[PDB]
């Protein structure tokens, strides 16, 4: 149904061959933030059938209003709902601790992931994303110790499922991370980009991380500007897609949602594709590998 993932030095293996998959990221799961209406089994089914998506990413809010801190069971439920649907539809599912300062609530993240590990640890579909987007923060002094603690907790329960760690400066500093990898099994590192804002320079940093023996994973990328607005940068988008395809980098487009911003796949209150949506759909359906 779904081949298990393993990280061997530089790349991610699905079963026994180097592979990469394309997918979608839901918007914030926070109560009242709109994206939550897409955390349904019906939507996941639509991505597998209509889009041919192989990945669905649950972006669980943590410290903002309506997030996991304010409503734990409420948010935990939307995630479980999406993961169960992904498992049923032969797709990979990323459970993401959608934070910008995760080091602030370490025990909370540990509590959450232990439960998720116990519940989903044996299905080859689940992937853990323990720190969405770290800011101007040190890798070795802030992100690494936090990540190691969480990974330690997970690994005690689930010894082999892929864990993805956020990198400094909006998950752009993957080179900085490669110079001080985490000594653990099946760990990947996140890279986030927005084709309307980031280019070849960010691609070079990625190349450097790849050269140092670290496997990357694009848990979030936009065809539009970093603030989620502006138009689609067609050229940069293509260049980025070729880069990921070449290096077998899995990716999740941000976000299958209908907020009134360029990054959304649908126009407000509709299933009518935006410029971004049409583009990403084409990208997702012609991807070389499927879950």
**Which residue out of 133, 176, 236, 261 is catalytically annotated?**
133
| Cβ-contact 167, 128 below 8 angstroms | no
CB of 84 to Ca ion, least distance (A): 16
Q: How far is the CB of 198 from Ca ion (least distance, A)?
A: 33
Write each residue from 177 to 216 as x if it is in contact with Ca ion (CB under 5 A), else as -, in one continuous string: ----------------------------------------
**Range 125-164, binding Ca ion (CB under 5 A):** 158, 160-161
Considering only residues 219-238, where is the footprint of Ca ion by CB under 5 A? none
Residue with tokens 């935990």: 76
What are the C-alpha distances in Å from 148 to residues 118, 170, 180, 182? Answer: 18, 19, 12, 7
Task: Give whichever of 12 and 210 is closer to Ca ion, judged by the CB atom.
Answer: 12
Q: Closest distance between Ca ion and the C-beta of residue 10, in Å?
A: 22
Q: Does the active-site annotation cover 115?
A: no
Q: At closest approach, how far in Å is the CB of 79 from Ca ion?
A: 17
Q: Which stretch binds Ca ion (CB under 5 A): 117-125, 225-233, 263-271, 275-283?
A: 117-125
Quick one: which segment of 14-22, 119-127, 166-174, 242-250 binds Ca ion (CB under 5 A)?
Answer: 119-127
Burial 21-59 (b: 16+ CB within 10 A, else e): bbbbbbbbbbeebebbebbeeebbebbbeebbbbbbbbb
List b or e across 100-116, with b for residues whose CB sees 16 or more CB atoms inside 10 angstroms.
bebbebeebbbebbbeb
Catalytic, 220? Answer: yes
Give the closest residue to 120 by CA, choosing from 148, 162, 164.
162
Among residues 121, 181, 199, 230, which is the contact residue for Ca ion, using CB under 5 A?
Answer: 121
Q: How far is the CB of 259 from Ca ion (least distance, A)?
A: 34
DSSP 51-112: I---EEEEEEE-SSTTSTTT-HHHHHHHHHHHHHHHHHTT-EEEEEEE-S-GGGGHHHHHHH
Q: Which is nearer to Ca ion, 64 or 84 (CB)?
A: 84
Q: Which of 36, 129, 176, 220 is catalytic?
A: 220
Counts of helices then strands in the chain (DSSP H, E): 9, 11
Q: Minimum CB separation from Ca ion for residue 53, in Å? A: 22
Region binding Ca ion by CB under 5 A among candidate stretches 43-51, 75-83, 116-124, 167-175: 116-124
In the complex with Ca ion, the residue whose CB is nearer, 89 or 161, is 161
* Contact call for residues 180 and 218 (beta carbons, < 8 A): no
The count of chain residues that interact with Ca ion, using the rule CB under 5 A, is 4
Residue 228 token pair:
């989620």
Rg (CA), the chain: 17
> With respect to Ca ion, which residue has the nearer C-beta, 108 or 160?
160
Q: Footprint of Ca ion on this chain (CB under 5 A)?
A: 121, 158, 160-161
Residues identified as active-site: 133, 220
């Amino acid at each position: 149904s779904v081949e298990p993932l393993s990280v061997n030095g530089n790349k991610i293996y699905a079963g026994e061959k180097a592979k990469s998959f394309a997918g979608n990221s839901l918007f914030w799961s926070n109560n009242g933030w709109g994206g939550e209406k897409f955390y349904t089994a019906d939507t996941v089914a639509s991505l597998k059938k209509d889009w041919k998506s192989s990945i669905v990413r649950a972006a669980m809010g943590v410290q903002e209003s309506g997030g996991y801190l304010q409503d734990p069971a409420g948010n935990k439920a939307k995630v479980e709902r999406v993961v169960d649907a992904a498992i049923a539809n032969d797709m990979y599912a990323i459970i993401g601790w959608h934070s910008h300062s995760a080091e602030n609530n370490r025990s909370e993240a540990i509590r959450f992931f232990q439960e998720m590990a116990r519940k989903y640890g044996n299905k080859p579909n689940v992937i853990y994303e323990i720190y969405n987007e770290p800011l101007q923060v040190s890798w070795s002094n802030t992100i690494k110790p936090y990540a190691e603690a969480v990974i330690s907790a997970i690994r005690a329960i689930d010894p082999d499922n892929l864990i993805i760690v956020g990198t400094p400066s909006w998950s752009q500093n993957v080179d900085e991370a490669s110079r001080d990898p985490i000594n653990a099994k099946n760990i990947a590192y996140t890279l986030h980009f927005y084709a309307g804002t980031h280019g070849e320079s960010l691609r070079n940093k990625a190349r450097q991380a790849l050269n140092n023996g670290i496997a990357l994973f694009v848990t979030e990328w936009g065809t539009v500007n970093a603030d989620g607005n502006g138009g689609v940068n067609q050229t940069e988008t293509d260049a980025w897609v070729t880069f990921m395809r070449d290096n077998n980098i899995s990716n999740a487009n941000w976000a299958l949602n209908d907020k009134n911003e360029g990054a959304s796949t649908y126009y407000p209150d509709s299933k009518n594709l935006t410029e971004s949506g049409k583009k990403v759909k084409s990208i997702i359906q012609s991807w070389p590998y499927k879950a």
